[PDB]
Enzyme design. Structure first.
Site, PDB file in Angstrom:
ATOM      1  N   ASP A  32      -8.560  -0.928  -7.938  1.00 41.37           N
ATOM      2  CA  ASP A  32      -7.861  -1.220  -6.668  1.00 41.37           C
ATOM      3  C   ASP A  32      -7.340  -2.643  -6.690  1.00 41.37           C
ATOM      4  O   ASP A  32      -6.264  -2.837  -6.138  1.00 41.37           O
ATOM      5  CB  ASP A  32      -8.764  -1.025  -5.460  1.00 41.37           C
ATOM      6  CG  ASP A  32      -7.978  -0.866  -4.186  1.00 41.37           C
ATOM      7  OD1 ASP A  32      -6.834  -0.401  -4.260  1.00 41.37           O
ATOM      8  OD2 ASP A  32      -8.523  -1.206  -3.139  1.00 41.37           O
ATOM      9  N   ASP A  66      -5.271   5.685  -1.089  1.00 38.80           N
ATOM     10  CA  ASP A  66      -4.653   4.927   0.040  1.00 38.80           C
ATOM     11  C   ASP A  66      -3.656   5.814   0.801  1.00 38.80           C
ATOM     12  O   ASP A  66      -2.804   5.284   1.550  1.00 38.80           O
ATOM     13  CB  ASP A  66      -3.992   3.637  -0.442  1.00 38.80           C
ATOM     14  CG  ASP A  66      -4.888   2.402  -0.451  1.00 38.80           C
ATOM     15  OD1 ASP A  66      -5.787   2.289   0.410  1.00 38.80           O
ATOM     16  OD2 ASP A  66      -4.674   1.546  -1.330  1.00 38.80           O
ATOM     17  N   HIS A 107       1.515   1.503  -5.690  1.00 35.60           N
ATOM     18  CA  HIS A 107       0.106   1.034  -5.743  1.00 35.60           C
ATOM     19  C   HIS A 107      -0.760   2.190  -6.254  1.00 35.60           C
ATOM     20  O   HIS A 107      -1.585   1.990  -7.154  1.00 35.60           O
ATOM     21  CB  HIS A 107      -0.331   0.505  -4.375  1.00 35.60           C
ATOM     22  CG  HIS A 107      -1.794   0.255  -4.269  1.00 35.60           C
ATOM     23  ND1 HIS A 107      -2.411  -0.780  -4.904  1.00 35.60           N
ATOM     24  CD2 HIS A 107      -2.756   0.882  -3.575  1.00 35.60           C
ATOM     25  CE1 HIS A 107      -3.696  -0.771  -4.613  1.00 35.60           C
ATOM     26  NE2 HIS A 107      -3.927   0.234  -3.806  1.00 35.60           N
ATOM     27  N   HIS A 134       0.830  -1.230   0.000  1.00 35.05           N
ATOM     28  CA  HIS A 134       0.000   0.000   0.000  1.00 35.05           C
ATOM     29  C   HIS A 134       0.857   1.270   0.000  1.00 35.05           C
ATOM     30  O   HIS A 134       0.686   2.099   0.885  1.00 35.05           O
ATOM     31  CB  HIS A 134      -0.921  -0.003   1.200  1.00 35.05           C
ATOM     32  CG  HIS A 134      -2.048  -0.954   1.071  1.00 35.05           C
ATOM     33  ND1 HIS A 134      -2.089  -2.129   1.755  1.00 35.05           N
ATOM     34  CD2 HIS A 134      -3.190  -0.883   0.360  1.00 35.05           C
ATOM     35  CE1 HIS A 134      -3.220  -2.735   1.491  1.00 35.05           C
ATOM     36  NE2 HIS A 134      -3.906  -2.001   0.638  1.00 35.05           N
TER      37      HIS A 134
END
Ligand SMILES: CC(C)Cn1ncc(Cl)c1C(=O)Nc1ccn2cc(-c3ccccc3)nc2n1
Ligand SMILES: [Mg+2]
Ligand SMILES: [Zn+2]
Length: 313
Positions: free
Chosen positions: A217, A107, A72, A68
């Site tokens: 995602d 995120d 990403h 994360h």
């Protein structure tokens, strides 16, 4: 105004493909993102000076965690870019703007821990936001960065366009809370089948953007096998650290987070492809036919995990 971004030939071509990998050169990821905004949105959507300063502040507020992270962020933004380019006319000027930023930001300041671990730890963020804990934080961090001096990439929007775009982004980030995926897709499934789905119904659009966010995602499962397989290591590196932290709290983690139960991963991937990934990209393809390459790529990777179990790798 006349300062385009260009990429080497192989990236110029491969970036238009759903399964594109952004590569191991961190210092090219910002250019890749700007390139995608300029082709998705126009060279006029943002002031380059402001966008670049927003991008670098967003990079700063992603942490050095295994999965994360900044990579990403840009990976999920590219998958949104691929969807938007393959669906040229279904999306408003504002939506194209809002969604690439939503993905880049979705995120922000992730620590590598599930909402679950925050609640069991009794993290202050779990007091402040009872559901979609990390996702409310990510949106809150996006609004913070947008309010830094010189960072309002949205400044040339009217008061009401501005509230619409922050509202697109808020829903887009909240929807990356996988706990909300299941109901969201079941509703979209009923609406497409019974025939009631209506893209001029804002509450319907919201759900469709919600599913796109889940799809982007999860796009790790839609890469070529070697990318998918190597990303799995980073995802599990976080899962097993969270498990270690669960045991420190005196709580046997679920097997997904237990590094003693590595053996069981291939079966666990299967569950997830069957229970989450396949249904997600199936519904997305029904609504947005040109997103089929994501479904095919996900099916290919399901087949690669079946091979792992059978001892053929
Ligand atoms: C990153 C994550 C937040 C969401 N995400 N993005 C991509 C992918 Cl892939 C996932 C994901 O969630 N991967 C899962 C999902 C469910 N699992 C279950 C098991 C497992 C393992 C061993 C024994 C038993 C079970 N492993 C699982 N892995
Ligand atoms: Mg998240
Ligand atoms: Zn994410």
């Amino acid at each position: 105004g006349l300062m385009q971004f260009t990429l080497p030939v192989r990236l110029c071509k491969e970036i238009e493909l759903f399964h594109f990998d952004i590569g191991p050169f961190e210092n090219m990821w910002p250019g890749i993102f700007v390139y995608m905004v300029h082709r998705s949105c126009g060279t006029s959507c943002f002031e380059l000076e402001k966008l670049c300063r927003f991008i670098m502040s967003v990079k700063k507020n992603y942490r050095r965690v295994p999965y994360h992270n900044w990579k990403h962020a840009v990976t999920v933004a590219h998958c949104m870019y691929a969807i938007l380019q393959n669906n040229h006319t279904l999306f408003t000027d504002l939506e194209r703007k809002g969604l690439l930023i939503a993905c880049l930001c979705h995120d922000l300041d992730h620590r590598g821990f599930s909402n679950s671990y925050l609640q069991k730890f009794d993290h202050p963020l779990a007091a402040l936001y009872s559901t979609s804990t990390m996702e409310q934080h990510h949106f809150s961090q996006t609004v913070s960065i947008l309010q830094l001096e010189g960072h309002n990439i949205f400044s040339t929007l009217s008061s009401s366009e501005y509230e619409q775009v922050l509202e697109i982004i808020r829903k887009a980030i909240i929807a990356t809370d996988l706990a909300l995926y299941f109901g969201n897709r079941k509703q979209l499934e009923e609406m497409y089948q019974t025939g009631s789905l209506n893209l001029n119904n804002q509450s319907h659009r919201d759900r469709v953007i919600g599913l796109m966010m889940t799809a982007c995602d999860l796009c790790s499962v839609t890469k070529l096998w070697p990318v998918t397989k190597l990303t799995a290591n980073d995802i599990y590196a976080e899962f097993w650290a969270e498990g270690d932290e669960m045991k420190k709290l005196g709580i046997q983690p679920i097997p997904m987070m237990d590094r003693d139960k590595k053996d069981e991963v291939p079966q666990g991937q299967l569950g997830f492809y069957n229970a989450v990934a396949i249904p997600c990209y199936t519904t997305l393809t029904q609504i947005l036919p040109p997103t089929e390459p994501l479904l095919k790529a996900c099916r290919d990777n399901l087949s690669q995990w079946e091979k792992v179990i059978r001892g053929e790798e």
